[PDB]
Design an enzyme around this catalytic site. Sequence first.
Site, PDB file in Angstrom:
ATOM      1  N   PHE A   1       0.657  -1.304   0.325  1.00  0.00           N
ATOM      2  CA  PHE A   1       0.030   0.443   0.146  1.00  0.00           C
ATOM      3  C   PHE A   1       0.819   1.725   0.415  1.00  0.00           C
ATOM      4  O   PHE A   1       1.928   1.324  -0.453  1.00  0.00           O
ATOM      5  CB  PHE A   1      -0.833   0.062   1.118  1.00  0.00           C
ATOM      6  CG  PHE A   1      -2.412   0.442   0.653  1.00  0.00           C
ATOM      7  CD1 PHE A   1      -3.444   1.897   1.222  1.00  0.00           C
ATOM      8  CD2 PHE A   1      -3.251  -0.497   0.483  1.00  0.00           C
ATOM      9  CE1 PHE A   1      -3.977   2.047   1.236  1.00  0.00           C
ATOM     10  CE2 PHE A   1      -4.556   0.214  -0.321  1.00  0.00           C
ATOM     11  CZ  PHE A   1      -4.895   1.415   0.616  1.00  0.00           C
TER      12      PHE A   1
ATOM     13  N   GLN B   1      -6.360  15.943   3.116  1.00  0.00           N
ATOM     14  CA  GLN B   1      -5.263  14.813   2.377  1.00  0.00           C
ATOM     15  C   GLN B   1      -6.110  15.033   0.828  1.00  0.00           C
ATOM     16  O   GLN B   1      -7.450  14.775   0.363  1.00  0.00           O
ATOM     17  CB  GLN B   1      -5.381  13.716   2.930  1.00  0.00           C
ATOM     18  CG  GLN B   1      -4.893  12.729   1.717  1.00  0.00           C
ATOM     19  CD  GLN B   1      -4.509  11.987   2.699  1.00  0.00           C
ATOM     20  OE1 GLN B   1      -5.437  10.703   2.928  1.00  0.00           O
ATOM     21  NE2 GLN B   1      -2.865  11.348   3.104  1.00  0.00           N
TER      22      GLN B   1
ATOM     23  N   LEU C   1     -14.230   7.545  -6.127  1.00  0.00           N
ATOM     24  CA  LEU C   1     -12.845   7.519  -5.007  1.00  0.00           C
ATOM     25  C   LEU C   1     -12.636   5.706  -6.130  1.00  0.00           C
ATOM     26  O   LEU C   1     -13.294   4.793  -6.199  1.00  0.00           O
ATOM     27  CB  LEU C   1     -12.666   7.139  -4.102  1.00  0.00           C
ATOM     28  CG  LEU C   1     -11.673   6.430  -3.122  1.00  0.00           C
ATOM     29  CD1 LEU C   1     -10.719   7.246  -3.506  1.00  0.00           C
ATOM     30  CD2 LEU C   1     -10.985   5.413  -2.140  1.00  0.00           C
TER      31      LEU C   1
ATOM     32  N   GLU D   1      -6.448   3.225  -3.284  1.00  0.00           N
ATOM     33  CA  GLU D   1      -5.111   3.215  -3.740  1.00  0.00           C
ATOM     34  C   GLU D   1      -4.633   1.683  -3.813  1.00  0.00           C
ATOM     35  O   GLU D   1      -3.404   1.707  -3.961  1.00  0.00           O
ATOM     36  CB  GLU D   1      -4.316   3.263  -2.006  1.00  0.00           C
ATOM     37  CG  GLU D   1      -2.803   3.879  -2.548  1.00  0.00           C
ATOM     38  CD  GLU D   1      -1.950   5.073  -1.180  1.00  0.00           C
ATOM     39  OE1 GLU D   1      -1.673   6.274  -1.875  1.00  0.00           O
ATOM     40  OE2 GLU D   1      -3.115   4.995   0.134  1.00  0.00           O
TER      41      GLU D   1
ATOM     42  N   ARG E   1       0.665  10.194  -0.349  1.00  0.00           N
ATOM     43  CA  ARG E   1      -0.481  10.631  -1.512  1.00  0.00           C
ATOM     44  C   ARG E   1      -0.127  12.513  -0.836  1.00  0.00           C
ATOM     45  O   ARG E   1      -0.296  13.059  -2.344  1.00  0.00           O
ATOM     46  CB  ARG E   1      -1.974  10.706  -0.198  1.00  0.00           C
ATOM     47  CG  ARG E   1      -2.213   9.441  -0.052  1.00  0.00           C
ATOM     48  CD  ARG E   1      -3.584   9.333  -0.093  1.00  0.00           C
ATOM     49  NE  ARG E   1      -4.201   8.759   1.278  1.00  0.00           N
ATOM     50  CZ  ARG E   1      -4.470   7.428   1.050  1.00  0.00           C
ATOM     51  NH1 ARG E   1      -4.831   6.507  -0.306  1.00  0.00           N
ATOM     52  NH2 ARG E   1      -5.139   6.889   1.588  1.00  0.00           N
TER      53      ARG E   1
ATOM     54  N   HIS F   1      -9.888  13.976   0.032  1.00  0.00           N
ATOM     55  CA  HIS F   1     -10.297  13.012   0.952  1.00  0.00           C
ATOM     56  C   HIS F   1     -10.627  12.549   2.035  1.00  0.00           C
ATOM     57  O   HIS F   1     -11.133  12.079   2.697  1.00  0.00           O
ATOM     58  CB  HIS F   1      -9.183  11.681   0.105  1.00  0.00           C
ATOM     59  CG  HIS F   1      -9.674  10.592   0.146  1.00  0.00           C
ATOM     60  ND1 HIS F   1     -10.336   8.945  -0.148  1.00  0.00           N
ATOM     61  CD2 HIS F   1      -8.456   9.942   1.299  1.00  0.00           C
ATOM     62  CE1 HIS F   1     -10.450   8.586   0.322  1.00  0.00           C
ATOM     63  NE2 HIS F   1      -9.579   8.101   1.590  1.00  0.00           N
TER      64      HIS F   1
ATOM     65  N   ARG G   1      -1.760  11.606   6.303  1.00  0.00           N
ATOM     66  CA  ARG G   1      -2.340  10.300   6.455  1.00  0.00           C
ATOM     67  C   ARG G   1      -1.774   9.386   5.264  1.00  0.00           C
ATOM     68  O   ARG G   1      -1.557   9.785   4.161  1.00  0.00           O
ATOM     69  CB  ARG G   1      -3.598  10.492   6.429  1.00  0.00           C
ATOM     70  CG  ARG G   1      -4.151   9.103   6.454  1.00  0.00           C
ATOM     71  CD  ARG G   1      -5.368   8.744   6.586  1.00  0.00           C
ATOM     72  NE  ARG G   1      -6.520   7.485   6.402  1.00  0.00           N
ATOM     73  CZ  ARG G   1      -6.634   7.503   5.042  1.00  0.00           C
ATOM     74  NH1 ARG G   1      -6.218   8.594   3.838  1.00  0.00           N
ATOM     75  NH2 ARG G   1      -7.196   6.073   4.855  1.00  0.00           N
TER      76      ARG G   1
HETATM   77  C1  LIG Z   1     -14.175   9.301   1.703  1.00  0.00           C
HETATM   78  C2  LIG Z   1     -13.466   8.020   1.812  1.00  0.00           C
HETATM   79  C3  LIG Z   1     -12.478   7.932   3.011  1.00  0.00           C
HETATM   80  C4  LIG Z   1     -11.919   7.044   3.028  1.00  0.00           C
HETATM   81  C5  LIG Z   1     -11.837   5.054   2.006  1.00  0.00           C
HETATM   82  C6  LIG Z   1     -12.678   5.577   0.883  1.00  0.00           C
HETATM   83  C7  LIG Z   1     -13.523   6.732   0.958  1.00  0.00           C
HETATM   84  C8  LIG Z   1     -14.173   7.136   0.045  1.00  0.00           C
HETATM   85  N1  LIG Z   1     -11.343   4.344   2.075  1.00  0.00           N
HETATM   86  C9  LIG Z   1     -10.325   4.070   3.462  1.00  0.00           C
HETATM   87  C10 LIG Z   1      -9.802   2.328   3.371  1.00  0.00           C
HETATM   88  O1  LIG Z   1      -9.309   2.124   2.501  1.00  0.00           O
HETATM   89  N2  LIG Z   1      -8.781   2.854   4.132  1.00  0.00           N
HETATM   90  C11 LIG Z   1      -8.526   3.674   5.002  1.00  0.00           C
HETATM   91  O2  LIG Z   1      -8.413   3.512   6.682  1.00  0.00           O
HETATM   92  N3  LIG Z   1      -9.266   4.951   5.311  1.00  0.00           N
HETATM   93  C12 LIG Z   1     -10.314   4.997   3.901  1.00  0.00           C
HETATM   94  N4  LIG Z   1     -10.746   5.888   4.110  1.00  0.00           N
HETATM   95  C13 LIG Z   1     -11.144   7.313   5.224  1.00  0.00           C
HETATM   96  C14 LIG Z   1     -11.922   7.095   6.548  1.00  0.00           C
HETATM   97  O3  LIG Z   1     -12.552   5.726   5.975  1.00  0.00           O
HETATM   98  C15 LIG Z   1     -12.043   7.316   7.322  1.00  0.00           C
HETATM   99  O4  LIG Z   1     -11.801   8.258   7.840  1.00  0.00           O
HETATM  100  C16 LIG Z   1     -13.080   6.895   8.330  1.00  0.00           C
HETATM  101  O5  LIG Z   1     -13.626   6.272   8.072  1.00  0.00           O
HETATM  102  C17 LIG Z   1     -13.997   7.556   9.265  1.00  0.00           C
HETATM  103  O6  LIG Z   1     -14.893   6.962  10.083  1.00  0.00           O
HETATM  104  P1  LIG Z   1     -15.563   7.913  11.289  1.00  0.00           P
HETATM  105  O7  LIG Z   1     -16.161   6.246  12.046  1.00  0.00           O
HETATM  106  O8  LIG Z   1     -14.902   8.337  12.398  1.00  0.00           O
HETATM  107  O9  LIG Z   1     -17.005   7.982  11.132  1.00  0.00           O
HETATM  108  P2  LIG Z   1     -17.676   8.185   9.858  1.00  0.00           P
HETATM  109  O10 LIG Z   1     -17.562   6.410   9.125  1.00  0.00           O
HETATM  110  O11 LIG Z   1     -17.938   9.425   8.958  1.00  0.00           O
HETATM  111  O12 LIG Z   1     -19.265   8.297  10.208  1.00  0.00           O
HETATM  112  C18 LIG Z   1     -19.962   9.183  10.912  1.00  0.00           C
HETATM  113  C19 LIG Z   1     -21.175   9.281  11.611  1.00  0.00           C
HETATM  114  O13 LIG Z   1     -20.981   9.593  13.073  1.00  0.00           O
HETATM  115  C20 LIG Z   1     -22.433   9.754  12.924  1.00  0.00           C
HETATM  116  N5  LIG Z   1     -23.029  11.070  12.458  1.00  0.00           N
HETATM  117  C21 LIG Z   1     -21.873  12.501  11.954  1.00  0.00           C
HETATM  118  N6  LIG Z   1     -22.950  13.868  12.416  1.00  0.00           N
HETATM  119  C22 LIG Z   1     -23.394  14.070  13.600  1.00  0.00           C
HETATM  120  C23 LIG Z   1     -24.654  14.155  13.700  1.00  0.00           C
HETATM  121  N7  LIG Z   1     -24.467  15.854  13.631  1.00  0.00           N
HETATM  122  N8  LIG Z   1     -25.240  14.453  15.230  1.00  0.00           N
HETATM  123  C24 LIG Z   1     -25.556  13.385  15.141  1.00  0.00           C
HETATM  124  N9  LIG Z   1     -24.767  11.881  14.586  1.00  0.00           N
HETATM  125  C25 LIG Z   1     -23.620  12.826  13.593  1.00  0.00           C
HETATM  126  C26 LIG Z   1     -23.318   9.608  12.001  1.00  0.00           C
HETATM  127  O14 LIG Z   1     -24.566   9.244  11.591  1.00  0.00           O
HETATM  128  C27 LIG Z   1     -22.160   8.814  11.230  1.00  0.00           C
HETATM  129  O15 LIG Z   1     -22.330   7.099  11.773  1.00  0.00           O
END
Ligand SMILES: *Cc1cc2c(cc1C)nc1c(=O)[nH]c(=O)nc-1n2C[C@H](O)[C@H](O)[C@H](O)COP(=O)(O)OP(=O)(O)OC[C@H]1O[C@@H](n2cnc3c(N)ncnc32)[C@H](O)[C@@H]1O
Lengths: 613, 138, 239, 102
Positions: free
Chosen positions: A122, A243, A255, A258, A289, A356, A400
């Site tokens: 990776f 990023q 997306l 990678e 990146r 990203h 990152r």
């Molecule tokens: C964009 C992206 C990122 C990504 C990826 C592919 C894409 C298209 N592939 C990855 C990969 O293969 N390997 C890796 O290590 N990272 C990869 N990324 C980045 C990574 O996935 C993200 O940084 C990470 O998954 C973020 O996860 P996190 O648990 O921190 O947050 P989330 O997935 O976005 O979930 C958000 C939750 O919070 C709740 N939420 C948000 N706002 C509120 C408010 N207003 N009130 C109540 N709840 C809220 C949402 O409901 C959601 O469940």
Amino acid sequence: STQYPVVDHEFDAVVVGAGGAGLRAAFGLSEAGFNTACVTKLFPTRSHTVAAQGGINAALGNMEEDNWRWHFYDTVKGSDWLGDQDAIHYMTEQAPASVVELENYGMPFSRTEDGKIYQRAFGGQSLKFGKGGQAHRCCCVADRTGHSLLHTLYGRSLRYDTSYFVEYFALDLLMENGECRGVIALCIEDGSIHRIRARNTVVATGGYGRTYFSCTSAHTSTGDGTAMVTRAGLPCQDLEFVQFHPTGIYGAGCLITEGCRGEGGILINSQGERFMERYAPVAKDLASRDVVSRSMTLEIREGRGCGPEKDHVYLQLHHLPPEQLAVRLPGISETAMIFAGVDVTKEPIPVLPTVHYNMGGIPTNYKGQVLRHVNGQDQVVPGLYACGEAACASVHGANRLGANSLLDLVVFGRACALSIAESCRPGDKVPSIKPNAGEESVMNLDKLRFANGTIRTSELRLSMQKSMQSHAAVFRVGSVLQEGCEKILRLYGDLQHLKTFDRGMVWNTDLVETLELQNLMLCALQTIYGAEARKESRGAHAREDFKERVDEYDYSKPIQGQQKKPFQEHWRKHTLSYVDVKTGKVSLEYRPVIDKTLNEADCATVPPAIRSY
Amino acid sequence: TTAKEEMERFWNKNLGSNRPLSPHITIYRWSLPMAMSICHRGTGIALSAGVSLFGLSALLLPGNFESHLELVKSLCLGPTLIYTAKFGIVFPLMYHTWNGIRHLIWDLGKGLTIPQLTQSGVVVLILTVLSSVGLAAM
Amino acid sequence: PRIKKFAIYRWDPDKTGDKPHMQTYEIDLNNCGPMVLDALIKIKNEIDSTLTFRRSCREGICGSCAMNINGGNTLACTRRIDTNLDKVSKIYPLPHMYVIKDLVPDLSNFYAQYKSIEPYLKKKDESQEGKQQYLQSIEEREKLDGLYECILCACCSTSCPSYWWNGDKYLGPAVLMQAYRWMIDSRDDFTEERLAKLQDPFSLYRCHTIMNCTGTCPKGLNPGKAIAEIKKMMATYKE
Amino acid sequence: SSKAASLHWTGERVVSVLLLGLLPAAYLNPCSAMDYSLAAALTLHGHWGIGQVVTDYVRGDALQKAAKAGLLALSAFTFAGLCYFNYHDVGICKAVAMLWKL
Ligand SMILES: *Cc1cc2c(cc1C)nc1c(=O)[nH]c(=O)nc-1n2C[C@H](O)[C@H](O)[C@H](O)COP(=O)(O)OP(=O)(O)OC[C@H]1O[C@@H](n2cnc3c(N)ncnc32)[C@H](O)[C@@H]1O
Ligand code: HEM
Ligand SMILES: O=C(Nc1ccccc1)c1ccccc1I
Ligand code: SF4
Ligand code: F3S
Ligand code: FES
């Protein structure tokens, strides 16, 4: 007020976010025996981490013999020495432990000859501390890893008595004399307002990609937790570091993983040249990146454009085996076809570097405690935690490392649970809150719901988005950033000239997207100002005026003969941005990175060095 | 909150609310497999009814079967019209016999891909018209 | 100028007397994106900011978009708009479901059923869990392909006529496929008791291989085949 | 934790393959013994058939029991009729044959 009903909930611990970060923290707290409530605006599956394609890093030594310390070095080197090593030590060491936990939860990892969790090369990972060549430690569920990760974490979370407030938009942090008491939330389903209080609060809301015009992230990545921290007066960190993932479909901005580059994929320009060998000699097209995409955005501005309008580049899978594409990467095989019409076997995918990952977020300990910056020092905010992309332990630093964020999710989500488990026990008295608390949050809702303006939410969002896309882009100069800073400041004053339409209680998507706009703008202000203030090129943030990496020393020559630069004279420090809600003024400060590890004898501190893969 | 408690509280919420059930048959696209499942149910109901009408007449109605056939000849209907009566007996019988095998093939876990349902589906439909015209000619 | 008409179901519970009705929106396709959601987003942003739907990724992996377009249950971000301007695209909420508001269904029961099958790994003695990775052959891994990918969009379960009538008691394909997803997972020890959980006329045996599930699945999977494979296990298991 | 609902499904497929086998066997060998077994399989399969329809459409605890009772009495009276027809009349096979050359 009085037009709205209030429903005060009482819990041991609140977790705001249902991603991987939030879920791991949530059910982990319940596993410790806490009355844990999870507050989430989306259903847990719908959370972004589901979109994660690449994989999850752990030095399990399944492909070749591996040491987690080598993984430590690769993360801090990739962080352009803005990464706090006390947190990286903790993450890279728990990495094997945390992954093996998931495989035991039931996460359907891909396998090998031995029957162990299949790993693969990776972006920017090496063996023997950057000397032993290519490293294979990215554990994956074949291009749908975050999907499986989120589904299994959620699946296993039904084993415990976690109270899931599904489809609840959290508005602001319940706060009293610095101490966090929980959250005040709007129930999307019926328009009601709920005050969920607890002794501890975890904030795992993820990134804020939707500040820019083009991103890979969901429509719901709106940095809401960041804003809740912002409006509390508590500082945000490193919000200018954004990023740009080198590979994403030119069209809608989806997306392409990678993992394509780790399985043998090459990037091809307008002449057909293997152009990443022209910049990076050692790592080539599998480099960090912050350099790969910045070499790509260089090619667009050159005139060597690779498309119908010479604006994007290509990712080539023409010389890859069709037998391997079906097994390793099937999720991109569909989404390249659906969003572009590309046979991944015969044709190359049109790619463009776009937003990203958000490096910054909510300042946090290696344990996971939110930090306020008092007296040029640090202070743990009582009962407030943050984990995931929402937080910033700066385990990622300036850039990152590939496939570390899903690890960051599990490890620090888990860490937040352990910090609560050790500091206090379940059944400890919940600190009671004022009768008139979070009262202005409700008024922010009510004023916005009946908003008689002149510029509707949708129009203002686009004005913010395209501004960030041309001002806070891959490259950025003082002149352009300066215009952007007062261009973004302009639109903050427009945040009352906004006209809403839908004026119901039940499912007012019109209202929540506007609340999201307030949060996106509050994110945007701190993002653009931090970039204009920072007068150096470090990782993802690269100034064309100051393409020099400004440290405490000139680390190109030996350390001895130099004297240390004063803290307020160099740029190897964390940007601590605040913003007044009423005036929209971004006043910022700084605090040092952490160099000391959790154990020097077990894991040595890696001093700053030259930056090029 | 448990699994059983979630459903239990789902129904209380909706059945006492002014929420409308979304359209289904009014809108959902008709497909061969779906329409062919309807006919299988129809022909089953049609056939069993006939069999029941046959039993519940042996116990209830007077005379013997030979007497009943002699009463059919009383109308001395056209050979084509008696063929039409005969065809309308075998047609629902055969369709159900052929599609019944298609169901039993499915039960073995075989032939359950979307193209195969339109393939074998037509093969059932074609076997029907042939075996019904075939049997009515005896 | 390429104008396309969209007929969309709309009902607002915050307006007394307002009953279910359709509403048409005209959109220039050269200004708009290629997918259905791009049009739903365009009218929401520009024409009418009341069209309340579910959207997250626009990538085809979260399962928010689930709705009935032109008689088929797919993701709005996967179905590309019909460039045939003579036809008017009909957008409906997922079939036979309680409408919360405009295309937003009540999926509480749907999720609640998913909870009842226990979608997690179960070991007879997991006092050694957490520390060592469980062994699984590459072949035993393929047994899960076509099964885990399910994003629980509720298109298939909501397309089944048996789920229309007996949604209360019958689990539907979506949930049942995941039950199978955990059945042939080699690591799981609770395979016999998982089958015994379906020992009633409704839970599993409301399937009549109508096959709308496989036909409508946006991710291309085959729930019916997995249901048929369960039925076989249900007949041929000892103890 | 007995498996009754599963065995019922297996039973329904068994009678189906039996009734599939009988319809050509009754043509080729049209005997008195074939008459009774044809009456046995025909009434049973259909009874389990409508039974499936009843469990599908007839909602409610109180209404469903009466529908299952009605179906049971109907199937009983049907099997009785066919057996009476086999014993005191021409019999299904020979009656079908007579009906066809008409
Ligand atoms: C964009 C992206 C990122 C990504 C990826 C592919 C894409 C298209 N592939 C990855 C990969 O293969 N390997 C890796 O290590 N990272 C990869 N990324 C980045 C990574 O996935 C993200 O940084 C990470 O998954 C973020 O996860 P996190 O648990 O921190 O947050 P989330 O997935 O976005 O979930 C958000 C939750 O919070 C709740 N939420 C948000 N706002 C509120 C408010 N207003 N009130 C109540 N709840 C809220 C949402 O409901 C959601 O469940
Ligand atoms: C010998 C040819 C026949 C075969 C192969 C056959 C097979 C089947 C099968 C397998 C089913 C269940 C469909 C499913 O899999 O869900 C069925 C349904 C049914 N059949 Fe038959 N059958 C035959 C003849 C008959 C006859 C002669 C009758 C009339 C007495 C009949 C009455 C019914 C009824 C009432 C149903 C219920 C409809 C449903 O559940 O969808 N069948 N048949
Ligand atoms: O309900 C059913 N009718 C139906 C099917 C499609 C559309 C409307 C009604 C049906 C049809 C055949 C077998 C089992 C069933 I549960
Ligand atoms: S099997 Fe397919 S149609 Fe059914 S819920 Fe899963 S993704 Fe949706
Ligand atoms: S649509 Fe249906 S009845 Fe079974 S095969 Fe699929 S659930
Ligand atoms: S919005 Fe995630 S699948 Fe359409």
